[PDB]
Amino acid sequence: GLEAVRKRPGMYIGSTSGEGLHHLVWEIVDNSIDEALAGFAKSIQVIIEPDDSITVIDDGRGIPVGIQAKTGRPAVETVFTVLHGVGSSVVNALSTSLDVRVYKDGKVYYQEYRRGAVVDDLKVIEETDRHGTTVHFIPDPEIFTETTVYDFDKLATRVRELAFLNRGLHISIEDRREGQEDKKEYHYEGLEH
Numbered sequence: 796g797l798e799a800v801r802k803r804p805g806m807y808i809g810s811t812s813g814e815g816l817h818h819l820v821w822e823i824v825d826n827s828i829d830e831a832l833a834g835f836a837k838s839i840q841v842i843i844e845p846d847d848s849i850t851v852i853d854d855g856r857g858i859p860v861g862i863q864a865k866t867g868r869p870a871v872e873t874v875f876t877v878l879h880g881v882g883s884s885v886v887n888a889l890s891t892s893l894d895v896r897v898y899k900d901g902k903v904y905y906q907e908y909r910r911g912a913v914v915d916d917l918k919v920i921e922e923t924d925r926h927g928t929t930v931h932f933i934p935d936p937e938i939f940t941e942t943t944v945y946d947f948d949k950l951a952t953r954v955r956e957l958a959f960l961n962r963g964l965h966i967s968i969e970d971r972r973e974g975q976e977d978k979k980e981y982h983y984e985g986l987e988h
C-alpha cells in the first residue's frame with residue numbers, strides 16, 4: 796500500500812527535492828479547488844506554519860465522513876490511507892504527521908496519521924457552525940533530505956495563477972515564519988465586475 800510511496804517517492808511526486816516538497820501543497824490544494832469547481836467552496840487559505848508545516852483550509856462541504864460499505868471505514872479515512880485530485884494519501888505517506896478536520900452537520904470530525912499510519916478512529920471532537928475541510932501536514936525530512944523549507948514567493952506565484960484559472964475563487968497564501976510574516980490574498984471577479 797502506502798509503504799510503496801514512502802520507499803519510491805520519486806515515482807509519486809516526481810522529485811524529493813524542493814520541487815517535490817512544494818508539490819505536496821498542490822496535491823492538497825487541488826482537492827479544495829475541485830470542491831470550488833463543484834460549486835461549494837468559496838475560499839481557500841494556504842498557510843506556511845512557523846515550523847515549515849502546511850495548513851490548507853477550505854469552506855466546502857467537508858470530506859464525506861460516513862462509513863463506506865466497500866471498506867467498512869469512514870470515507871475521509873480512505874481518502875488519506877488508500878492509494879488512488881487523488882493525491883491526498885501520497886501527501887499523508889510522505890509526512891511525519893497529517894491531521895484532518897472536517898466541519899460538517901454541526902460537528903468537527905478529526906483524524907490524525909503518522910508517516911501514513913492511522914493514529915485513532917475518526918472522532919467528533921467539537922461542535923461547529925461552519926463547513927469545510929482543514930488539512931495540516933508536516934513533510935517528512937526522511938523523504939525530503941535536501942530541504943524541508945518552503946518558498947513563499949514560489950507558493951504565492953502559483954496561488955495567484957490558481958486564482959486566475961478559477962476566476963471567482965478567493966485564495967490566500969500566508970507565511971507565519973519568524974521575521975518574515977506575510978500574507979497575499981487573490982480574487983478575480985466574475986460577472987459582478
Ligand SMILES: CCc1[nH]c2nc(Sc3cnc4ncc(=O)[nH]c4c3)nc(N3CC[C@@H](N)C3)c2c1Cl
Nearest residue numbers: 826827830851855856857858859880883928929930
Ligand atoms: C482541504 C483539502 C480537501 N478539501 C476537501 N473537500 C471535499 S468536499 C466534498 C464533499 N462531498 C463530496 N461528495 C462526493 C464527492 O465526489 N466529492 C465530495 C467532496 N472533499 C475532499 N475529498 C473527497 C475526495 C478527495 N477529492 C478529497 C477534500 C480535500 Cl482532500
